[PDB]
Amino acid sequence: SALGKLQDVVNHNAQALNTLVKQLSSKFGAISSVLNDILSRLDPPEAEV
Amino acid sequence: ASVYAWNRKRISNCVADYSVLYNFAPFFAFKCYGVSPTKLNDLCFTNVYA
């Protein structure tokens, strides 16, 4: 582990991007996470909320 | 059936068209949760109980 510092920089950036991409699957309270279902099975007035 | 003896049923393996309802009656109470009735006829489902 002589190059710990450079390796650590690389891993921190990679981990940040990973968590940002993974967080797209969470629902946050909506009936579904993908926009397509929300916009498919619901009228526009309720799809807004 | 009566309220405490509701008649459960399963309905699968069929091309289901929800527009045979509208020829039935004035439909005093008709409200859908989770899905709009207008855009129903297109969508697909896992298991439909009645």
Swiss-Prot record, chain A:
Annotated coiled-coil segments of the chain: 7-49
Function noted in UniProt: Subunit of the fusion protein that is processed upon entry into the host cell. Mediates fusion of the virion and cellular membranes by functioning as a class I viral fusion protein. Contains a viral fusion peptide that is unmasked after S2 cleavage. This cleavage can occur at the cell membrane by host TMPRSS2 or during endocytosis by host CSTL. In either case, this triggers an extensive and irreversible conformational change that leads to fusion of the viral envelope with the cellular cytoplasmic membrane, releasing viral genomic RNA into the host cell cytoplasm.
Protein name in the entry: Spike protein S2'
Span covered, complete protein: 943 to 991 of 1273
